[PDB]
Amino acid sequence: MATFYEVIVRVPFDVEEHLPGISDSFVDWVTGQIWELPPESDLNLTLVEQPQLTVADRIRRVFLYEWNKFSKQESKFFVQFEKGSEYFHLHTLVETSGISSMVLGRYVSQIRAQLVKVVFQGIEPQINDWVAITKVKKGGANKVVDSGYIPAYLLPKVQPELQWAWTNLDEYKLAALNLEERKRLVAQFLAES
C-alpha cells in the first residue's frame, strides 16, 4: 500500500501563551472566518472550534504547498485536525514519494520557517516541538506508515476530539467529514484483520 510520513503540528492560537508579540490582525483573522459543513458531512458544527480550525487550515495548505515544492508533485495526503488533551494539533500524513528520510528533517525545518512567516507574521510559536516528525522511537528513524494507518488510527476519532479532516485520496474523501462513512471503513478494517 501507499507509504506516508507523519508530521504532527501543534496549532498556535493564544496570543499570550502561544504567540506573544503578534499583531491584532491575527485575532481579527481567526475571529472573522466563518466555517460551514459541506452537504455530505454529518458532523455537529457546534463542537468544531472555528478560530483554531481557521489557523489549522492555513497551516495545512502552507505545509502542503511547501511540501509539493520539495516532492515536485501534488503529493497525496490525509490531514486530520484534532482537539487533544493539551493541544489542538494536525496529524499530517504526506506520501514519501520524492522525499528521502535523511533529508526530511531539513525539509520540515524549512516548512516550519515558512509557516512562521506566512501564518504567524514572523512570530515564533511558544509551543514545545510544535512541528514534529513522528519517529519509530526517540532518536530513531523517521516513521513510515501505509494507508492502513488511516482507518486503523485516524478514522476512529469522534467529536470533539475529531475537529476536521482533509484528503486528496479518493478512498477517504467521503470519510474525511463523515462519521457514518468512518464507521463503515473502521468496520471493514477490523473484518480484514
Least Å distance, CB 68 to Zn ion, is 10
Footprint of Cl ion (CB under 5 A): 84-87
Q: Which residue is catalytic, options 65, 87, 107, 153?
A: 153
Q: Is 49 annotated as a binding residue?
A: no
Q: Which is nearer to Zn ion, 82 or 181 (CB)?
A: 82
Could you give the string, one character per residue 49-88, with x where binding to Zn ion holds by CB under 5 A and - elsewhere?
A: ---------------------------x-----x------
Q: Which is nearer to Zn ion, 72 or 117 (CB)?
A: 72
Q: Is 18 annotated as a binding residue?
A: no
Binds 82, which of Zn ion, Cl ion, none (CB < 5 to 8 A, cut-off by type)? Zn ion
- Are 134 and 91 spatial neighbours (Cβ–Cβ below 8 Å)? no
- At residue 4, what are phi and psi to the nearest 5 degrees? -140, 155
**Burial of 108 (C-beta count, 10 Å sphere; 0-12/13-18/19+):** buried
21-54 exposure pattern, b = at least 16 Cβ within 10 A, e = fewer: ebeeebeeebeeeeeeeeeebebeeeebbbbbbb
- Are 37 and 43 spatial neighbours (Cβ–Cβ below 8 Å)? yes
Q: Which is nearer to Cl ion, 157 or 173 (CB)?
A: 157
> Which residue reads 528521502 in cell numbers?
100
Active site residue 153: yes
User: Among all residues, which ones are annotated catalytic?
Assistant: 153
**Annotation: binding site:** 73, 82, 89, 91, 95
Which residues contact Zn ion (rule: CB under 5 A)? Answer: 76, 82, 97
